[PDB]
Amino acid sequence: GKAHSEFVQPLPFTLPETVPLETLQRFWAHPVRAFFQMRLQVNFRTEDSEIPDTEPFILEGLSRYQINQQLLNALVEQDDAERLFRRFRAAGDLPYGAFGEIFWETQCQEMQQLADRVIACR
Amino acid sequence: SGIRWGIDDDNVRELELPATGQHTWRFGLTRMLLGYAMESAQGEWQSVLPYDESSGLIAELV
Amino acid sequence: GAQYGDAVPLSLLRDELAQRLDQERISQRFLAGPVNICTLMPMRSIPFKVVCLLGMNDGVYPRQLAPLGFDLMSQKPKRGDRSRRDDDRYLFLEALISAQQKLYISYIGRSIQDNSERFPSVLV
């Protein structure tokens, strides 16, 4: 039999005139991933996973990352956090009652600790 | 949406569990219909945050 | 039609309907014309030129069915009994004598998991 040819090949391409900034940002975030996902339009997608079996008792990953970003963006404007806390408790992504309260009380403390030296030079 | 458990409050109280009033199909459909009704940034109404996605001509699936 | 009178929970009807739907078979095309694949059919003896068997290891052939545990005829044997073990051991000899030209018998000797050892059956 004949062996597998190497995947890397010289490829013809002509440079366009105008390029957006965020296109450069997404390219330079991870160039191999960019070459796969915008040059020849494939994506090795981790397909849509199954529904989690229960309500989240504890938060990790993006499910707390966007919460941290939203809390920092709210706290940098020196606004009330109780309104946004009510918003998330209405949305339904917090532990029931006391555990969510304690989670909020520690997350707000750490984001305020960052936000003090953030706002020191605003 | 966040729908994981059984159907209604009778179902969650029949198996002798506290009525959390959330993460059920009635709660999810109410959230989705309220999100069809208004926008999400305007605020909560009945401790339910409306869902931003379904607003167009796709909502017959609801 | 058997004239029952009381009520029934739905689980009886549920699993009874499941077993009744998973009971029916199809035995239509035993003599289609190409090569035939079938179980060792009880009460059958047909001459053929080539006969081949599979799965002759220990603990699988013959079948090992325990009785119900309170049977009466299992304590007083008689002449007209029909045990599955004796039926299989008779069917093996019938299949041996039904051959005409060749024969082919195989089993499993080495377990694929850790290269342990197996054994064929007492008949072979």
Added chain:
Amino acid sequence: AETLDPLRLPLQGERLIEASAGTGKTFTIAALYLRLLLGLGGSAAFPRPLTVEELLVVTFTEAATAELRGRIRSNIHELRIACLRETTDNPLYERLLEEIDDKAQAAQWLLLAERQMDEAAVFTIHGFCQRMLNLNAFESGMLFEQQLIEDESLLRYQACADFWRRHCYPLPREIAQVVFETWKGPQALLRDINRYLQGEAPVIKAPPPDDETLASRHAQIVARIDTVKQQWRDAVGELDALIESSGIDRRKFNRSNQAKWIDKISAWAEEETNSYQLPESLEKFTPRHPLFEAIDQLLAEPLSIRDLVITRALAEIRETVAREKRRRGELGFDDMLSRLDSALRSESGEVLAAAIRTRFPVAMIDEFQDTDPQQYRIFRRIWHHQPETALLLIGDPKQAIYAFRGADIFTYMKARSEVHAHYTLDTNWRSAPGMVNSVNKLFSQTDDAFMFREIPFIPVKSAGKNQALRFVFKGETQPAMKMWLMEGESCGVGDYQSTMAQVCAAQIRDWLQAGQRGEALLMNGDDARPVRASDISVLVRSRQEAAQVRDALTLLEIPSVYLSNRDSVFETLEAQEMLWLLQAVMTPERENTLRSALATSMMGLNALDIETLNNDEHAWDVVVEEFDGYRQIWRKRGVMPMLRALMSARNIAENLLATAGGERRLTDILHISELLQEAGTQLESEHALVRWLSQHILEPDSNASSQQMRLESDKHLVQIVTIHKSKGLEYPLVWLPFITNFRVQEQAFYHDRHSFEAVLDLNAAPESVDLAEAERLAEDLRLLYVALTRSVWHCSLGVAPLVRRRGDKKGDTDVHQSALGRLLQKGEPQDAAGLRTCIEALCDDDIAWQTAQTGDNQ
């Protein structure tokens, strides 16, 4: 305390035969089976001969059962023809022909018993009880069809979620904060209590009252601290301690902070200033108050909610999962034993107890190490009394390496007391007299080498047929045991695993290069063979140091095969590619996700190959019908006709073979394809196989069928395998590098010295900690003895004097807290100076010791 002649064993009452490793245990049970099957022995035999259907052999693994049945099948077929010929080439059957009175009745009995061999009663433990419960239905309470399942984790977690939902939710925050501090959620809670729930429920030391609820206990603790916090404000305010150089100014600041510490009520964790406020503290470092003795009361016994929470969880989770299993109609392999035990314990089944002993008037047990207390209760209740029905026991009292599965040595410890007779076998038939002398000499320094009087000394005699096994290398010969001493004072075994783990690989490479050049030899008598590059093996304790030893060998350019590969097949790249490849068949129209499969490394295309197909329309149109037909084949016949058509059509199996190691990758496709058939014969929804696969991708279970297979057998590399998967195999050359390090245990869980029950103290009593630590000390010694029933010719090992503290120069060590250091230090704490000559004292013709070599030979 005496040896055994196998013919001279009386088959009455109870007989226990202790048999150490290197014995031929299989070659002992068959002789007794053949003797009892016809009834030889005269004054020391059973009253009547028995047919084969009346005999019971209980064995652990089906791989052992199928081999034992074949061995008896061969022995009967040999002895029967030997009886007809009346002359036998084997001395054992020559001896057994002495007591045979009739040389024509035996030829009838053996021939009639041989035809019934297929249904001989030799089962496993689970199959024994199921058959007995099916045979005895009414008094037991069994259903007639059992949907069998074996995955007791999903139901366990699902039911634990309900307990956490209904017993943690309505608490107030001031109580729930302390609960949240210890463990966050049910997933975190189950990890630390999973091993307690399985099997038999233990007995808890110091049980709290059965009605003390959570709020009542919390308020009681609040009131317990309330009086001390209220009355400390009058205790502070007088100089009742002499200030001096021993009187630190920080304690003045400590009750200065105690004045602040009388602040509130919701604070839980008290300050450490109260520890010096005790009569047992300040007097040695006057009563001084009536409340001064109250703090000594409340700081001698700790405080928490964890005991009550765990105790309230443990019974209810077991009750709920059992109720759900009963309601749905399944039954577990870990449940049938307990179901039989209750029926035997109750008074209803005495007719069952008589009926089973009527049908099975003999009992023998294989290996007896995994003697569960549930099983031993059954055996002692059935056959310890009710005479003229004897029982035999075959046991190997050490080597005890199924504690994580559930085997308990205390059941055997109790069982040794009541049984009277004791027997031991000596002949090895396996290894060198030098090795036998080494394993006899290594344990004669101190009596009771395992802190247990209930297990004896180990006198083992070598064989006589193979009394000249010699290993010769480079001129002179080579002694049995060669230990490697580490230079220095206080170095970790991590230092060995980083630097000096290459020394063993260097010696291995030297051995292989010398063997291929005819310098090393392997010889018996006068015949000789060269040493191959295959039979040398090395053993480790845990999976982590496999990486620490692999780099020491691949640096010197010897590839190494791995036998502890408990990695599931689902973790590799092939399953991730296979999910995309199969789901693209399910979605043959969505052009975004259809292109996932053609870019895979399995499919084998290039960038120029995809670029010319993206722009073209007709080349895209070609593959549409090819996948459409594949979907029709799957919807018509099954996964195999669908998948093997793709495996054949694109000419991929041959093309992978030309690549470097594509044959290594190709096996996993067929393994996954085989697993999909047993998936799809159970599951009937066609679309649900994809969600089954994605569900099984996430959690990597370590079950049987999900493991890999081996590839090469013409040649073999150096084999690395763990201790647990190293049972009953012959190894010429071994290496035991890291057998000097230890790992102390923390959770207090011990067995009582008299009751032998699983007593459990959820607190942290050091008296119980020492008792739970002595068992960990003994099991490491037993595993060390497991490590030395190998190495027919030569064994070697390393050692390192590791001190627990971070400093080096202190004059002591900590290896005597481990296994080998205690037996080499004779139960005393020593140092390097006290160990250097102790190592060299007992060296005579069998201990070739060498210093640490910080260098590379090739």
Added chain:
Amino acid sequence: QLSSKAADLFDQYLVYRPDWLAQWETGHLVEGLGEAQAWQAPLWKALVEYTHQLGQPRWHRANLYQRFIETLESATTCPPGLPSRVFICGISALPPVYLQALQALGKHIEIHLLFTNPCRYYWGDIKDPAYLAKLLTRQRRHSFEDRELPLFRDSENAGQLFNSDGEQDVGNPLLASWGKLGRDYIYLLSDLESSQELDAFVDVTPDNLLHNIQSDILELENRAVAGVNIEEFSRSDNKRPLDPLDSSITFHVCHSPQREVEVLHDRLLAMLEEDPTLTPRDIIVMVADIDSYSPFIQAVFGSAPADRYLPY
């Protein structure tokens, strides 16, 4: 579950033990039985009482064929409205009451039984020494002559038939180990009064190993060598030889059922290729259990390419 199991047991009782049901209808027990009859008897009594109380029909299997044989014993040559001629073949094992009914029916209607057996001479059991003297009558052939079991007197009056059981010296261990059902069934068959028997056996010439096996299992002679004396054990060439390139009976060992099916596929294809006159209407293959093996058969016989695709 209990109701279904009891229904199955009563069906088997009704087909096999008529006298126990006849006694339990009256109400007395039957001596000598084991346990569980003390509750199984009044259950059946109450069942028949209830099914008479409901007005349902009363006749069932046992009292049906008993009165059938009773009214067939005393009648004319044939009652009107019956089939004149009948053939019965493919029989190996039926309950003895069916044979009793066929015995009662044979006096009036012509019947034929195409019983099959792998032996020619008698190989059954014996009850009494007076039984075998009755068995010494003659069996004929279809056209011309008669025949009977070999060496008419000294063997069967000798220690062949041991005092209680059947032949202790059957010889061929294959037959003596596997033919329990056949031996019992032929003993049941050979205990009639109107039984007129005549056979037609085709001999087989020994040329292949399988033909050797069939000839030795038909003629009832042993070909084993135990090696009793030293000369017999030393010599080896007293048996029959075989050609070393014979494949009449082969064996094959594999590791997985998929590999087994692949091996059978390639071997069957090779034999079909080398032998010209072999129609695939002849080759059959049996398996132990079809539900655990049919996916691999589907696999090979769907993934076979069309160039040499054999049907199935």
